[PDB]
Amino acid sequence: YSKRFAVFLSEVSENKLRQLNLNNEWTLDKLRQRLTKNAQDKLELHLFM
Amino acid sequence: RILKPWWDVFTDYISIVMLMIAVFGGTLQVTQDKMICLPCKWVTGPTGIKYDLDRHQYNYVDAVCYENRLHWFAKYFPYLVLLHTLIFLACSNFWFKFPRTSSKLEHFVSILLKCFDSPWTTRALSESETGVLDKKEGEQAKALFEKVKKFRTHVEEGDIVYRLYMRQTIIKVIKFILIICYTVYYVHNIKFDVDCTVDIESLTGYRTYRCAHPLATLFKILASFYISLVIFYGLICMYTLWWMLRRSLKKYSFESIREESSYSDIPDVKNDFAFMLHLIDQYDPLYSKRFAVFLSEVSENKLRQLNLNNEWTLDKLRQRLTKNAQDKLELHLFMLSGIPDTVFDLVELEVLKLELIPDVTIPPSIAQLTGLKELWLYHTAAKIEAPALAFLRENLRALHIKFTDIKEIPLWIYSLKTLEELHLTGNLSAENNRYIVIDGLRELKRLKVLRLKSNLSKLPQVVTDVGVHLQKLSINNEGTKLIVLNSLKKMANLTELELIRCDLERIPHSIFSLHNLQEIDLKDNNLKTIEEIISFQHLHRLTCLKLWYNHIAYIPIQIGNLTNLERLYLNRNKIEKIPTQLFYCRKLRYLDLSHNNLTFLPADIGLLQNLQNLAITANRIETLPPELFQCRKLRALHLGNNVLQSLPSRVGELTNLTQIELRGNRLECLPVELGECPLLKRSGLVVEEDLFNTLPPEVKERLWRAD
């Protein structure tokens, strides 16, 4: 039980959590929708925050 | 219910120990209490004395001495304890189950438990930041904040809980002092070994009875234990009173709210009643912090702003996209409190309309709308304070600041040096308020169209003439008497000038130097006979002459001087005679003779081969000249509001005549030569059932089979 509490307290793990939310909520098909643009193969994190 | 302080917890447990003593003394007092009595008589060595008495009489003198010569306090000690501790239970139990203020507490703990429960207050307590929640906790926080306001209405810093609490705690204190007085006064009236002397002597023959009570030591020790329990009990009750007079007020916790809020970076928080809040201040200030952080209007303002953000949808603005010229959106006239965030979703938008909104800030993600270039920001005070201004520094070209007062001109916004047209209606500004339009608009070098409409000016600003980039000017709807002559000629790239609703008797003569002038607008002026076209003929580019709403009654001979004139508006003045020299302006495509006093058209109309649309409405012409056929480019035969009678076969000449106007005439003949109507469909205000009765295959088959 103390192992559960400290493991949840670690910043690397919750950092991996929010990065993991951004993983499974920014999928391969999403960048498939964002592939090909004006001159070249341009990917937008442009204006996205 | 779990709001009780610690001393009321001690009141509960000391109370139940106290009644446990009561039921112990009562039970023991019933089944084991008796008295032992035997008479004092005087007042192989040792032998037992004998009495000539009986077991009968011993029980009798037991009952007589036990009832008579024994103290009632020792008789009824557990009953006084039992009834008296139910006074204490009735104090705290009755104070909490008082009906109306108990409803106040029940309502209060219901909103209090939800106020612990709301994870939005975890979020809003936890923190230009973003983050999108779901729907229904917004609804819960809506009606949750509503019921907080309902509680704020029902209480208004009440007094029933304070004075009712104060009355029950003060009767607890004075009852405490009362009973410790007489019980300490009666403990030494409990004795182990009593001396009885009764009227029994004719029945048993003895006066005095040494009587031992075998139980008074037990009642004595638990009586002393009892009052020891009470002095500890009521002593803690005195400590409650000492806090009541020492540190407790009606708004002291309100200062803990607002000093806590200044400590908690959400400063301005209102207040609801503190003494009940003081008891939970004694419970924990953490739960106090949950309550005030929910209470602040900035916080719930942010909540309903997010309710707006997820409760304007893509189908809503999708069904609000395409308008007058382009893709134009409206929060215009809609009194919305905030901009939706799905606004910057849909890049199809080009012209944004934002009347009546309290958004001082715009999100930086609005630059995703790369199609947006025309912006309407009226009845608002958007002072964004974000790096999105650089975003729109290289985006947009049109600004609309209508009906905006002197203070509500967002100053930092006009640094975008790609603005090209400006709309400043409603700057009701004096010369000191003229400087409140601060010259940071001088830096915006790309301003080409300037709108200074609908205000209280008399002279233009000296900062006005610094922009030679300006090509289109309007100074409209003012009290305009005076024009500084140098400022007009300084902006020589002026091509279109607007004098709408001005107090001009005449025109400024210095207009001759503005050789780029093509379009001149003179609506609603006091014009009699005009300044010479010798001035206008120096204006070589003059093509558009707009002479609306004057009271000039005669046109000078120099009208046959503007060859480049194509658009002539002579609407609503006192013109009666048609000047002959109208024929020379052969580039004339539109002739406006409307709202005059006209008699008859001379033959100058036939030489106007470029005439496509003719307006002679609101006149007094009765018969058209035969020069109708030479106006072969005529599409709009605008013949309204006259005393006209009929038409010749010249109507069949015009191959591009599409619309005919006869707004109130004789129109009795309804001629058949309309049935040679090669492209026309709508003789618009000629439409009557009379003309629809006449010419059956021509009107009905040509028009109604053409439709």
From Swiss-Prot, chain B:
Q: Which residues lie on this side of the membrane: Extracellular?
A: 188-217
Effect the entry attributes to changing R55F: Affects ion selectivity of the channel
List the disulfide bonds in this chain: C37-C211, C65-C196
Q: What is one cellular component GO term in this UniProt entry?
A: lysosomal membrane
Descriptive protein name:
Volume-regulated anion channel subunit LRRC8A
Top-level taxonomic group: Eukaryota
Site (described: Required for anion selectivity):
R55
Record field: transmembrane = 7-30, 76-94, 166-187, 218-242
Post-translational note: N-glycosylated.
> What does the entry give for GO biological process?
aspartate transmembrane transport; cell volume homeostasis; chloride transmembrane transport; cyclic-GMP-AMP transmembrane import across plasma membrane; intracellular glucose homeostasis; intracellular signal transduction; monoatomic anion transmembrane transport; monoatomic anion transport
Q: Which residues lie on this side of the membrane: Cytoplasmic?
A: 243-707
Family, according to the entry, reads as follows: Belongs to the LRRC8 family.
Kindly give the PANTHER family that the UniProt entry links to this protein: PTHR48051, RAS SUPPRESSOR PROTEIN 1
